[PDB]
């Protein structure tokens, strides 16, 4: 799943 902490947005 999208890594919110790294990407900042999902």
């Amino acid at each position, epitope marked *: *799943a*999208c*890594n*919110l*902490i*790294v990407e900042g*947005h*999902c």
Partner: antibody
Amino acid sequence: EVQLQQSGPVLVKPGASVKMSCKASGYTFTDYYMNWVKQSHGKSLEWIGVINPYNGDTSYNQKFKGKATLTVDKSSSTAYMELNSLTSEDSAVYYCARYYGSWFAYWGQGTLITVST
Amino acid sequence: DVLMTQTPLSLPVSLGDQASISCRSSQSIVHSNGNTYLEWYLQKPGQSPKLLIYKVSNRFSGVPDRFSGSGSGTDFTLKISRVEAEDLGVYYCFQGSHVPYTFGGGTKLEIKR
């Protein structure tokens, strides 16, 4: 001077729900993601999910999908976790833990949930 | 999920000794952006966990330099030099590179006397 103060321990019945809080002080609440972590007695730590207080975005460990719901109230600088459909397996200490580039740089003191009749 | 395997489960160490804790991941912890989000925590009896090391080898503010983190890819090590009695507790490795984030099972540091 960062402090995360979690709400007090709670005894709740199987099948019920419970909502616990994590009150942030000493920094700008919206600046950093807030994580939640479960620790069952004598067991390892488990990551439940993360919320961005800036905009309410969330990301969950699928193990806790439909078990845990993360929210924030920006005006009160408080993060919340609500657990539903409680079973004995949900008896644990629950921590909020704040991001700082690192994942869990500051931890609350934990909230002890006991699920029992 | 990425599995984090710590060894040993229990680590007895004398005051002033060096303790070494191993953490191996089931797949590389190097993120596509090049960072390795491998961290080490200590949970002392009755307390919340506390951050010691982030991004493999970086000490959090206030952590003394006798704690050192090393390794890369799938194999990581925490070395605690000049062990003090107050170092006892359970040490955890942790990866944030892959969702869901996962913890190692813990290593209980015991003081020999």
